[PDB]
Amino acid sequence: CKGKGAKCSRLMYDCCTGSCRSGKCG
Secondary structure, eight states: OBOTTOBOOSSOOOBSSSSEETTEEO
16 A cells, blocks of 8 residues: 555555545545
């Protein structure tokens, strides 16, 4: 996963916190 605030993609839940937030994990 990525650290909340890490550029993510369309939507593939790759955050360590939750989901994407405006293109940034969160």
